[PDB]
């Protein structure tokens, strides 16, 4: 579930170290941190944090057996106010308007709460009631004219991360990262915003590359880790399985070095050995997809946009130039290719 390889993107200083100084690869995913550009600005948010969570508060109003509309709202004014209404017996049919029951917006058409019947419809002047179970009880608003549909955003302060031409994630007034990474686009009453992987909705411009949130936005979960935290154990143990076999024998082999490759992009460290001196270098790692994009021609290793040079036919992370000029990558010649040249070496002072 990891990238088949991780080729570096920018190597640098090559300094000498010994065995006692060997670290296993932080194989932890790190969010996009290249976006150091901190540009402050003002951005929109949903007033309540989340797409799912928003509500026009509301009431109910009963009937006689059907209720009437003009008074059921005029009854909502009194219950909050001029108090004009404040045996088994008979059905004594008159009205009452109990409240303190609200609702939530569902993102396509927004009128859903326990409402004996699933959903209702729209509540502009076209229809001034949302019938519910039976006929006895009728309406469910706060203000008679759509007050919440378009009047539920806010503005704020913050810093917009970015690299050069790509636009990066937010830093909030609460000091934290909220990234547009793998998000999706939502249009809210005209303004073009983005739902993040968290239900928090922003009104950021069309980032240079996104796709519309599907109608999979109702419970905010639907398509909604763990399996990855398992493999992290069983890989960064081969690192120490190998780090032990290098520490308890003073003898490295090019196979064992590959296990120290940072298996996921980001700022980690890169290792190789020329003869007897083990040496370290920092590198931002880049994901590899298939072997064809880094070994195109005889002896070549694509390092950004170049061919990395053969230094005695060894190249980093245990990649060596073999009998002919095939660049043989350890993990790649583990495609049913048995190759023996990479097994004996030593370490000193």
């Amino acid at each position, epitope marked *: 579930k990891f990238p088949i390889y991780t080729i570096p993107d920018e190597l640098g200083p090559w300094s000498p170290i010994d065995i006692h100084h060997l670290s296993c690869p932080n194989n932890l995913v790190v969010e996009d941190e290249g976006c150091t550009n901190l540009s402050e*600005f*003002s*951005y929109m948010e949903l007033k309540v944090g989340y797409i799912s969570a928003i509500k026009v508060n509301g009431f109910t109003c009963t009937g006689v057996v059907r209720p009437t509309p003009d008074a059921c709202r005029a009854a909502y004014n009194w219950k909050m106010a001029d108090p004009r209404y404040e045996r088994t017996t008979k059905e004594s049919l008159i009205i009452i308007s109990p409240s303190v029951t609200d609702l939530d917006p569902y993102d*396509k*058409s927004l009128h859903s709460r326990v409402f004996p019947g699933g959903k209702c419809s*729209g509540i502009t002047v076209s229809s001034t009631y949302c019938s519910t179970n039976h006929d006895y009880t009728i309406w469910m608003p706060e203000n008679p004219r759509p007050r919440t549909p378009c009047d539920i955003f806010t*503005n704020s302060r913050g810093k917009r991360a970015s690299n050069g031409n790509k636009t990066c994630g937010f830093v909030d007034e609460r000091g934290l990262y909220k990234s547009l990474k793998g998000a999706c686009r939502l249009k809210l009453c*005209g*303004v073009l915003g983005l739902r993040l992987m968290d239900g928090t909705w922003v009104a950021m411009q*069309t980032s240079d590359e996104t796709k519309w949130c599907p109608p999979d936005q109702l419970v905010n979960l639907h398509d909604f880790e763990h399996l990855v935290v398992e493999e992290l154990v069983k890989k960064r143990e081969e690192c120490l399985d190998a780090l032990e076999s290098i520490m308890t024998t003073k003898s490295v082999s090019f196979r064992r070095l590959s296990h120290l490759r940072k298996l996921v992009p980001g700022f980690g460290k890169a290792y190789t050995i020329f003869n007897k001196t083990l040496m370290e270098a920092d590198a931002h790692y880049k994901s590899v997809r298939t072997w064809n994009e880094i070994i195109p021609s005889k002896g070549c290793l694509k390092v950004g946009g170049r061919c990395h040079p053969h230094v005695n036919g060894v190249f980093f992370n245990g990649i060596i130039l073999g009998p002919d000029d095939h660049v043989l990558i350890p993990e790649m010649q583990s495609s049913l290719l048995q190759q023996h040249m990479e097994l004996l070496k030593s370490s000193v002072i």
Partner: single-chain antibody
Amino acid sequence: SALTQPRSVSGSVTISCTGTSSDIGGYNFVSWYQQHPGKAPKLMIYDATKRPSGVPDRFSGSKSGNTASLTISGLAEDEADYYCCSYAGDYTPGVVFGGGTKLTVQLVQSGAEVKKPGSSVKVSCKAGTFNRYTVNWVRQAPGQGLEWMGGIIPIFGTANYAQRFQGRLTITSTSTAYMELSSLRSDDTAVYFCARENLDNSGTYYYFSGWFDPWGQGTLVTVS
């Protein structure tokens, strides 16, 4: 093909605008505009059937969900092209326009400018009603139809640009608006106007719905 208009109608005469689009919840805001030559379009119909609140003379506004309509009252000075403009709610960001109906019977800008290579051009648009307001910018290529490019809600400091012009456009106390292009490439050579929308309630409010009534005018830019 976005909307639909008869290329021209001869003559009471009527123009249709099939393509009234109501989004996923129920909102529809066809808003018409008339274009005299070299003159900026004036708002003649908003919210399907309503007349412009200041000075209106022709009186017709119709809509049948799948069709909007416009029935002129008089039968010589009406002579012009006519365009419609509605909202759209799922995948599209702003407003759309028609394709020309040759009917047969205040603000400022930056001014006339030219550029040789695809480098930048910057327009100004001086002017406050104080209500909900979304300033925008529109493009008409030489003798073709209208084309919304992007918007800006100055209060929240957020801007919506369109898809064909994303990234190349950058729309932004003095009653002053602006507009910037990142690469002129000759296919964008056109005339550029500034306009906005100012209303309170959701009945005829969607941000960038088509209620462009404060209208600017006059940025004719040339690329080489």
